[PDB]
Structures are given as structure tokens and as C-alpha cells.
Design a protein around this ligand. Structure first.
Ligand SMILES: [Zn+2]
Length: 137
């Protein structure tokens, strides 16, 4: 319990361009259940070695927003352990990210409205981290 950004996590966020990391740190406390950082910024080995597969001409590993450092990925911590199956808590945890961004002013928003347009493309019923990824809006 009371998880905190390790040496790798603290760095990932410490390498972010914007101040989105702020909401993350505060959220860890504000939110009911702690959370562990998974990814924050892309090093010179990630997007660089991303072309290790084969296609070097199509070198452009921008599948996410981490490239622009305007987004990060985290995991909802519960019972002193990672809760990837307990999406229930994910609601109380993520809710802190959106609530923390409004008070801190930091740009924070998830992909919950994008799917509202028609159907659930994020697959919130499946329990995926589709919308989990937080980015600046
Ligand atoms: Zn991500």
C-alpha cells in the first residue's frame, strides 16, 4: 500500500515536457487507492529500437502519445497489489485524475466521450486500459 514512483517511474515523469506529471503525483494521494506508474516518456532506446522489427524506412513508433510527452500510463494499486482485473477500483482511481486536473489546472482527460459518440470502442466492458492512458487535452 501507499505505492510510489520508483527510480524508473520518478524519472519517466521527471522527463515529461508538460506538467501532467503533477496531477499524477497528487492523484496518488487524492485518490482512494494508490497507483503505480507504468510508462511516462519514451527514451532514446524505445522509439529508436522500435525499428528493430525490420522495416527501417517506416521508422516512426508513434502508436501512442508518449512521443510528444503529452501523455502517460499508470496502474490502479489496491490491497498492496496491482488491480488489473478489479476495474471497479479503476473508477475511483481514474476519477481522481480528472478531478485533480480541474483543481490543479493541469490538462487531463480520458477517452470516454470519444466512444460516447456512438458505441463503446474503448471496450470499457472488457476491462481494458484503452481509456486508462491519460493525455493532455
Ligand atoms: Zn499508453
Amino acid at each position: 500500500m501507499s505505492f510510489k514512483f520508483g527510480k524508473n517511474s520518478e524519472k519517466q515523469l521527471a522527463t515529461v515536457k508538460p506538467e501532467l506529471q503533477k496531477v499524477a503525483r497528487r492523484a496518488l494521494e487524492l485518490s482512494p487507492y494508490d497507483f503505480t506508474i507504468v510508462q511516462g516518456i519514451r527514451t532514446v532506446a524505445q522509439s529508436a529500437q522500435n525499428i528493430a522489427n525490420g522495416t527501417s524506412f517506416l521508422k516512426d513508433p508513434s502508436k501512442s502519445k508518449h512521443i510528444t510527452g503529452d501523455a502517460i500510463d499508470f496502474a490502479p494499486y489496491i490491497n498492496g497489489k496491482i488491480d488489473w482485473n478489479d476495474l471497479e477500483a479503476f473508477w475511483a482511481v481514474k476519477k481522481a485524475f480528472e478531478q485533480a486536473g480541474k483543481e490543479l489546472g493541469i490538462k487531463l482527460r480520458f477517452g470516454a466521450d470519444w466512444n460516447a459518440s456512438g458505441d463503446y470502442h474503448d471496450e470499457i466492458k472488457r476491462g481494458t486500459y484503452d481509456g486508462g492512458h491519460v493525455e493532455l487535452v
